RNA sequence: GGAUUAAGUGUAAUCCUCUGAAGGUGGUCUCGAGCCCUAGACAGCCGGGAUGUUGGCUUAGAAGCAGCCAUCAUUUAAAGA
């Protein structure tokens, strides 16, 4: 489902837990996960569209890898020249690649999490976003 | 060698290596004799003396002497006091001082809360003040810092116990203040 | 055990397989460790293992003191880095009191002439400065291999110097 | 003349004979090596140890610090996912 959660806000039962909690989502993972990325932009209402599979695994959004990387980097643009320009563009945490890969995963068909991260990294490489 | 001049407000006047201090707080004396050393004399100002000697040996001395004085100076004017709290696990401790260090004199009672009081000794000229409230502070002071020192200490140590472990019980009184 | 009247050379030759049989097998695993083949020699970081003594470590001495050595070389991820080399072999055979030759101390028995000591063990001998067993790789860590040999030495009768790369 | 030693080490050439091998000491003296310093060191010393965010994954947990991936951005005098 979808809800609008404050940037750095988490586990509380009344707001969060029973909505999704009955869906099969595990609140603990989401609270930390959501709060984690949401740290860079705090105080901002980010509506989350959580998607839960039969696995009861889930992902949520800000929609595209380039966009996701852009936001993770917190930079609006991609480097003019990805290979040459790097730090200028920006950087993202290795974990963040994992984060994006995980959210994107329903879309991606990587065999493993490592593969998915590699897929996202490929996009980042083009953008001039270093990991 | 070195020369220490101080303070006004406190006199000196040492003869035949006894040494002294003056006031206004009470005076302390300290023999300060060791090896061919001058045993510093007051030089119509303040005392400081060196003996023609060698290197380290005398040097470890006539350094120490310097520190014994200069802490005799401050122990005569504005004395030295050490201060610290008592407190631990259930039931309080009874600290109180009766004249003299002697058994059943110097404080402490129920350590944890044991029977039989255990405490001594007190130094020559030290004063044991007591707690502000029922019990939660001690002040130990006196002119000499060498009696006042191991009075508050030897009152902390008189809580130390070699048994279970310090960790489990943390009774005792410690003078955190210096 | 203990090794006393074992590693001091106060004898002379042989090993000689012709002459001797019933030699015990060495309990010293392979003297080729780490990845062999490729020349480890291209490496930063260097060597160790200098005896600093006289001689004759037994195979009992080297074989648990060397793989003991290797064991804490395992830290560098199994098959990934360094080659370990051992130098000298335990050729040298020793004999021990079989009461028939002479008298008194070992290599002497009972009677005069007669039973030389019966074969029991072999030990390589070394000189004042020889490299007992060396090899290295790039500075993997501070020097795990240097840590190796700490343990390696401390089971040698000799006092071994680490020796810097 | 000079220096070391604080253990009564030692005051024991050789050796059945004089043991000592792979306990401790910021007592003090002497010698060497590395790094840091007036773009100010140590104390060097004193005081302090940002927001998204518990980054993504993994995991019972995994919150800077088991492990894998990423290592951006913000607010900054400054502060690493």
Swiss-Prot record, chain A:
GO CC term, one of those recorded: cytosolic large ribosomal subunit
Subcellular location field: Cytoplasm
Keywords noted in UniProt: Cytoplasm, Isopeptide bond, Methylation, Phosphoprotein, Ribonucleoprotein, Ribosomal protein, RNA-binding, Ubl conjugation
Cross-linked sites for Glycyl lysine isopeptide (Lys-Gly) (interchain with G-Cter in ubiquitin): 118
Domain of life: Eukaryota
Molecular functions per Gene Ontology: large ribosomal subunit rRNA binding; structural constituent of ribosome
Note: Present with 68500 molecules/cell in log phase SD medium.
Subunit structure: Component of the large ribosomal subunit (LSU). Mature yeast ribosomes consist of a small (40S) and a large (60S) subunit. The 40S small subunit contains 1 molecule of ribosomal RNA (18S rRNA) and 33 different proteins (encoded by 57 genes). The large 60S subunit contains 3 rRNA molecules (25S, 5.8S and 5S rRNA) and 46 different proteins (encoded by 81 genes).
Similarity annotation: Belongs to the universal ribosomal protein uL11 family.
Protein name: Large ribosomal subunit protein uL11A
Organism field: Saccharomyces cerevisiae (strain ATCC 204508 / S288c) (Baker's yeast)
Originating gene: RPL12A
Interval of the full protein contained in this chain: 13 to 143 of 165
UniProtKB/Swiss-Prot annotation, chain B:
Keywords of the record: Cytoplasm, Ribonucleoprotein, Ribosomal protein
Subcellular location: Cytoplasm
InterPro entries referenced in this protein's UniProt entry, alphabetically: Ribosomal_uL6-like, Ribosomal_uL6-like_a/b-dom_sf, Ribosomal_uL6_a/b-dom, Ribosomal_uL6_CS2
Gene3D superfamilies for this protein: Ribosomal protein L6, alpha-beta domain (3.90.930.12)
Principal localisation: cytoplasm
Pfam family, one: Ribosomal_L6
GO biological process: cytoplasmic translation
Cell membrane is among the record's keywords: no
Single Gene Ontology MF annotation: structural constituent of ribosome
GO cellular component, one term: cytosol
Function: Component of the ribosome, a large ribonucleoprotein complex responsible for the synthesis of proteins in the cell. The small ribosomal subunit (SSU) binds messenger RNAs (mRNAs) and translates the encoded message by selecting cognate aminoacyl-transfer RNA (tRNA) molecules. The large subunit (LSU) contains the ribosomal catalytic site termed the peptidyl transferase center (PTC), which catalyzes the formation of peptide bonds, thereby polymerizing the amino acids delivered by tRNAs into a polypeptide chain.
Family, as annotated: Belongs to the universal ribosomal protein uL6 family.
Subunit description: Component of the large ribosomal subunit (LSU). Mature yeast ribosomes consist of a small (40S) and a large (60S) subunit. The 40S small subunit contains 1 molecule of ribosomal RNA (18S rRNA) and 33 different proteins (encoded by 57 genes). The large 60S subunit contains 3 rRNA molecules (25S, 5.8S and 5S rRNA) and 46 different proteins (encoded by 81 genes). uL6 lines the binding pocket for eukaryotic elongation factor 2 (eEF2).
Other noteworthy facts: Present with 52400 molecules/cell in log phase SD medium. There are 2 genes for uL6 in yeast.
Protein name in UniProt: Large ribosomal subunit protein uL6A
Organism: Saccharomyces cerevisiae (strain ATCC 204508 / S288c)
UniProtKB/Swiss-Prot annotation, chain C:
Chain's gene name: RPL10
Full-sequence range covered: 4 to 168 of 221
Function per UniProt: Component of the ribosome, a large ribonucleoprotein complex responsible for the synthesis of proteins in the cell. The small ribosomal subunit (SSU) binds messenger RNAs (mRNAs) and translates the encoded message by selecting cognate aminoacyl-transfer RNA (tRNA) molecules. The large subunit (LSU) contains the ribosomal catalytic site termed the peptidyl transferase center (PTC), which catalyzes the formation of peptide bonds, thereby polymerizing the amino acids delivered by tRNAs into a polypeptide chain.
Keyword Lipid metabolism set for record: no
One CC-aspect GO term: cytosol
Entry keyword set: Cytoplasm, Isopeptide bond, Phosphoprotein, Repeat, Ribonucleoprotein, Ribosomal protein, Ubl conjugation
Modified residues (Phosphoserine): 140
Domain of life, source organism: Eukaryota
Organism name: Saccharomyces cerevisiae (strain ATCC 204508 / S288c)
Annotated protein name in UniProt: Large ribosomal subunit protein uL16
Keyword Protease set for record: no
Source lineage: Eukaryota, Fungi, Dikarya, Ascomycota, Saccharomycotina
Quaternary structure and partners: Component of the large ribosomal subunit (LSU). Mature yeast ribosomes consist of a small (40S) and a large (60S) subunit. The 40S small subunit contains 1 molecule of ribosomal RNA (18S rRNA) and 33 different proteins (encoded by 57 genes). The large 60S subunit contains 3 rRNA molecules (25S, 5.8S and 5S rRNA) and 46 different proteins (encoded by 81 genes).
Location in the cell: Cytoplasm
Glycyl lysine isopeptide (Lys-Gly) (interchain with G-Cter in ubiquitin) cross-link, chain position(s): 37, 98
């Amino acid at each position: 489902l979808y809800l609008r959660a404050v940037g750095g806000e988490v586990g509380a039962s009344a707001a969060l837990a029973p909505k999704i909690g009955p869906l099969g989502l595990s609140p603990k993972k989401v609270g930390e996960d959501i709060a984690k990325a949401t740290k860079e932009f705090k105080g901002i209402k980010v509506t989350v569209q959580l998607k839960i599979q039969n696995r009861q695994a889930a992902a949520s959004v800000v929609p595209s890898a380039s966009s996701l990387v852009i936001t993770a980097l917190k930079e609006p643009p991609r480097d003019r020249k990805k290979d040459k320009n790097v730090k200028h563009s920006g950087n993202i945490q290795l974990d963040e690649i994992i984060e994006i890969a995980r959210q994107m995963r329903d879309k991606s068909f990587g065999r493993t999490l490592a593969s998915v991260t590699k897929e996202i990294l490929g996009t980042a490489q083009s953008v001039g976003c270093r990991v | 060698e070195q020369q220490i001049e101080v303070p006004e407000g406190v006199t000196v006047s040492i003869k035949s290596r006894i040494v002294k201090v003056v006031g206004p707080r009470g005076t302390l004396t300290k023999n300060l004799k060791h090896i061919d050393v001058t045993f510093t004399k007051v030089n119509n100002q303040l005392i400081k003396v060196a003996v023609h000697n060698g290197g380290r040996k005398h040097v470890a001395a006539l350094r120490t002497v310097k520190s014994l004085v200069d802490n005799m100076i401050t122990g005569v004017t504005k004395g030295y006091k050490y201060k610290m709290r008592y407190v631990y696990a259930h039931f309080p401790i009874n600290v109180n001082i009766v004249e003299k260090d002697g058994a059943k004199f110097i404080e402490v009672r129920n350590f944890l809360g044991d029977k039989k009081i255990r405490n001594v000794p007190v130094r020559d000229g030290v004063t044991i003040e007591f707690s502000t409230n029922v019990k939660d502070e001690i002040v130990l002071s006196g002119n000499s810092v060498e009696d006042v020192s191991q009075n508050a200490a030897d009152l902390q140590q008189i809580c130390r116990v070699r048994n279970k472990d310090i960790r489990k019980f943390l009774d005792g009184i410690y003078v955190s203040h210096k | 055990r203990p090794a006393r009247c074992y590693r001091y050379q106060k004898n002379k030759p042989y090993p000689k397989s012709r002459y001797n049989r019933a030699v015990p097998d060495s309990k010293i695993r392979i003297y080729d460790l780490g990845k062999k083949k490729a020349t480890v020699d291209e490496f930063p970081l260097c060597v160790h293992l200098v005896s600093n003594e006289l001689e004759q470590l037994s195979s009992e001495a080297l074989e648990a003191a060397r793989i003991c050595a290797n064991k804490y070389m395992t830290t560098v991820s199994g098959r990934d880095a360094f080659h370990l080399r051992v130098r000298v072999h335990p050729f040298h055979v020793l004999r021990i009191n079989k009461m028939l030759s002479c008298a008194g101390a070992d290599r002497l028995q009972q009677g005069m002439r007669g039973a030389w000591g019966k074969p029991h063990g072999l030990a390589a001998r070394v000189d004042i400065g020889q490299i007992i067993f060396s090899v290295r790789t790039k500075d993997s860590n501070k020097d795990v291999v240097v840590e190796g040999l700490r343990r390696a030495r401390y089971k040698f009768p000799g006092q071994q110097k680490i020796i810097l790369s």
